[PDB]
Paper text:
Plexins are a large group of type I transmembrane proteins that serve as the major receptors for semaphorins. The plexin cytoplasmic region contains a juxtamembrane segment, a RhoGTPase binding domain (RBD) and a GTPase activating protein (GAP) domain. Instead it is active specifically to the Ras homolog Rap, and this RapGAP activity is critical for plexin signaling. Semaphorin binding to the plexin extracellular region induces formation of the active dimer of the cytoplasmic region, which triggers its GAP activity to inactivate Rap through the non-canonical catalytic mechanism for signal transduction.
We therefore removed the linker and directly fused the coiled-coil with the juxtamembrane helix (the N-terminal helix in the juxtamembrane segment) of plexincyto. In the CC(a)PlexinC1cyto structure, the two plexin monomers in the asymmetric unit form a symmetric side-by-side dimer. The two juxtamembrane helices are oriented approximately in parallel, extending well beyond the main body of the proteins and integrating into the C-termini of the coiled-coil moiety. The dimer interface is formed by the juxtamembrane helix and one side of the GAP domain, burying a total of ∼3200 Å2 surface area. The center of the dimer interface is a 4-helix bundle structure comprised of the C-terminal portion of the juxtamembrane helix (residues 567–584) and the N-terminal portion of helix 11 in the GAP domain (residues 929–943) from each monomer. The core of the 4-helix bundle is dominated by hydrophobic interactions, involving residues Ile571, Ile575, Phe579 and Leu582 from the juxtamembrane helix and Met933, Ile936 and Leu939 from helix 11. A loop-helix segment (residues 1038–1058) between helix 15 and 17 in the GAP domain of each monomer wraps around the C-terminal portion of the 4-helix bundle. In the active dimer structure, the last two turns in the juxtamembrane helix (residues 585–591, corresponding to residues 1282–1288 in mouse PlexinA3) convert to an extended loop.
Author numbering:
A (entry chain B): 531 to 622, 633 to 790, 795 to 844, 847 to 885, 896 to 913, 929 to 1145
B (entry chain A): 529 to 622, 633 to 702, 704 to 790, 796 to 844, 847 to 885, 896 to 912, 929 to 1145
Write the structure that this text describes.
Amino acid sequence: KVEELLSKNAHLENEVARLKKLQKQMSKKMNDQLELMESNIRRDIRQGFVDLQTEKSDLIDNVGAIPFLDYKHFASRIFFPEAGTLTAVMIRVDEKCLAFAELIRDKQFLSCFVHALEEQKNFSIKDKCTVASLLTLALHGDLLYLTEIMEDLLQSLMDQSSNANPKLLLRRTESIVEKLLTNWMSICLYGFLRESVGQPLFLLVSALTQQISKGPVDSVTEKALYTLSEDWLLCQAQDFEPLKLKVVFAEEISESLEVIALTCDTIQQVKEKILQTFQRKFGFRYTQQIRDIEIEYEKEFVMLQEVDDTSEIRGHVTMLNTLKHYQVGDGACIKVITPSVKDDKNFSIKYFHLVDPKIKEMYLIKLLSTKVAVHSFVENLFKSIWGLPNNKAPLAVKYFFDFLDEQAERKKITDPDVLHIWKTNSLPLRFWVNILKNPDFVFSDMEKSPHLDGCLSVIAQAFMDSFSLTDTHLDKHSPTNKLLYGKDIPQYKQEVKSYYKLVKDQTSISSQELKTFLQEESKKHQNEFNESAALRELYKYMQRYFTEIFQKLEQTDAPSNLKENMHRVKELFD
Amino acid sequence: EDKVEELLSKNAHLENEVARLKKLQKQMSKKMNDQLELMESNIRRDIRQGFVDLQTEKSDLIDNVGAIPFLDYKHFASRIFFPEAGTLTAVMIRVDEKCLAFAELIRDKQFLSCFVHALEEQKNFSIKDKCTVASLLTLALHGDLLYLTEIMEDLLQSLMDQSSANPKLLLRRTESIVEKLLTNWMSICLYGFLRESVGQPLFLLVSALTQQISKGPVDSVTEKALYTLSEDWLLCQAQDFEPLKLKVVFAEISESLEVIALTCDTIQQVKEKILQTFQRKFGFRYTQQIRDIEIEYEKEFVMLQEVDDTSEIRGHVTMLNTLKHYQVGDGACIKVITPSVKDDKNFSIKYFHLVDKIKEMYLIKLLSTKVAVHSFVENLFKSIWGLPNNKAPLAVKYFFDFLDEQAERKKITDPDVLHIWKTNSLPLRFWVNILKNPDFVFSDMEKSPHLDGCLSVIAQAFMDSFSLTDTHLDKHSPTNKLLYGKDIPQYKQEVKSYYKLVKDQTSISSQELKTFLQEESKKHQNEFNESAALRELYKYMQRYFTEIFQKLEQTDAPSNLKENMHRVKELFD
């Protein structure tokens, strides 16, 4: 048994030797790894600083004519932004409808109708917005009458019970008159939108798209290097270098084009950068549908795809194919002719790009760096929103603001903060904010990404804060989203106070001019929507609360012919 | 056969080693993984903090002073004429026959002309000598600036038409006598405008740079700090600290005042900050001499100094007493009445403050500083190239019109050349020296080397404003150029305008010119003794006597003149 002792002893000696060596190896390895990470930290921090200090201004991308959506779809997204079971038919039988439409146009009927429906516990906000939008559809050919009824309704909404504090009015769209007012603002402001606000909004979108496209984007988390929102910022680092490709379009025709991509871009992302560079350099899409262009690399002429038979696999997730993967260098000929992975249901839990299983803050500069680069387009858009084209505000605004003036007067109020509260609560917060946050509603072929929605959310949060009436003091404890535009807000606050004041000072609106305009806008889209389906869906509510409506109608000394009309519509639809 | 014993014993020992080894290894592994974690967190906490600071900088640099403490013109000129040795300056600051002879001599245009030219035609004559005699001449003729202007101008006409190679390389640097002459002339003629428009914004910029650096930790040793404008002065290692709102009182009669110091300041630094916060607050200093104010702390009444019996010691170097060392809390009352270690020759090699690794981490601070002070800088600059009531200072309008005139006589149809001369003679000759040396202009101006580094950044930017080359900024640049880089192009435009606007201003009437120059002559007539100056100048005259006489003969000089020249050498000898 001394044999086993000699074997175990020799082994013990030898194992001590190994452990001793292993300790030293792992020590040196650790120290080296440390040096590496440190060097990378320095390099990336400095590179970030340098980027901030040296950002060229290349977001200058010409467009000319702007691809607005048809008014029907804009309105469709602004009236009903949830379901579209009726929108389709309302975009693209006469006796009962005529009866309901004749009925509706009677002021006291519509009044007692709305008032009755809003006098129900059984009546929710969704119903309210529904019937309000149906009303607008029904009376879009008669905006003047619509306006009048809305005014009477608003007067009621003030004088009635909201006297607890005049500042808590129109905070949010809950009543029928509120939804009504929103929709109204969309209608009467659509023109001014296309004239003044449309273009700079597009350019802000164009630019934002582009500036993010200068830096690496995880195709999975949808996170990137350039952003305005700290949540979308990339955690882990990324080693990469840009490529100046020479993409050509095609005994075949010639059409060269310099396109800038990266060594870490997925094929699809490169197709994006090329369609984008195209529409930004020329003003028109090469192909409207992104799923038509064949992309081909010339090795010595090989077609390239999202994934091929040579993709790395780690654990349970596959790595996408970048550009380094196909060994692509600087000045590589790329062909685009005329002949998806993301279409898969399970895409985010099967594919891998730039994150796997951590100094995020070293990229904070990028926020600033992005924020500066895009700032120009912002102040434009913003100053186009609260602007006075030829010292004149849009008629809708001037009228409605003068109305608020009148009503504040009629309530006997001596505190401008209130009028400011109404004014902000009825225009920038009901309408403009909803546009800045959703530009796809306005423009044709406007595919809007979640990240872009995040950044636009930051820009809009700052837009709202422009109208604040409270002196926010920025300190170490504040959202990063608020610390980006912080220094700029107190300016906007002053321009906003201005905008309101100058409007109040602008001359009154001639009733002849208001009527002319409103009837003009009625004419522009009279036959765009069918009153048919709207009145039809509206009567559903009418008969749902018929008894109540009738009772309220009695409560205000109504004529015979009117009640007879009501029962007549009921007896025609039934 | 007892081997079984040994093999066991040995194995025991061996196995034990293995055990320990593993444990050791294991523990060490953990340590590393923890170390990482810590540094990671620390890094974030600083990076973010820096970012946050850039986004939250309040404007508290608003510190009043009122009337500015200028230096007597005597010392200003003393430092702008001789910026090196002051063995002669002190004599001029605070024989009748011979001196009057020399003074009457110099006032002849032909003698002084031939003097200068001959002197400038000698290889034995160094630059330092040329500047020396130029300054001596200026001192000697300060009461007669009209004559001085005249001789200077004729000398310039000479230096210009004598070259006949490229007009863009005139007035580049100070090497001929005419050039140092030109500089000194500028100082005299513009000291007025200095006090007028450039005095205040410069002093306020110094006050501002002073305050902003005082906001963060400053290594008392390497003189490096957290808030700076040059990457070089930026701190390396992190420092851990919180601010302190001290209730400083002045003694028992009393007087209260809030001060903001740090939990990592040397006592001396705290003294600096109380004096500075005071003078920024009231407009005057409680004490001019900084070594008369006693600093006392109250714990139960206890005095505190630079080092005590309980100072930490590592390796072979001592650590200074911070405010944390004496356990000073937020709101600690500090007594100040009327009754250093930095004075020790071997100071920097014996002590320790904040160094004993990621520096780029603090690049934000440069910005954070650069932004914070920008206000003041744009003042100073836009004061320098500004036009008070649409009128450039007489001196400037005059000399610039002179340069136009001369350029026109050379048939030069190139605007770039006029621009080159104009920048080469005014902003680079005079203004830069003042940005980089505000202590020449101000009473009691302690200028730290760091402050000099920063001013060197700002001055480099200033200089870059007058440049005629479009600079494209890329990743390969200094940090100092990267800071103000996006600001330079606007300036270059303001400068081109300024030169155009000076030119388009109405000319200067000879009556107004003479009035001005004689007025400025009569102001400072008695501030310097012509005696010692002429005395030191005659040294130069007799050194190169024969050559002067030769240049004189070669220019049809009259008898009475040469007779005078020999007469003077007769008097001094």
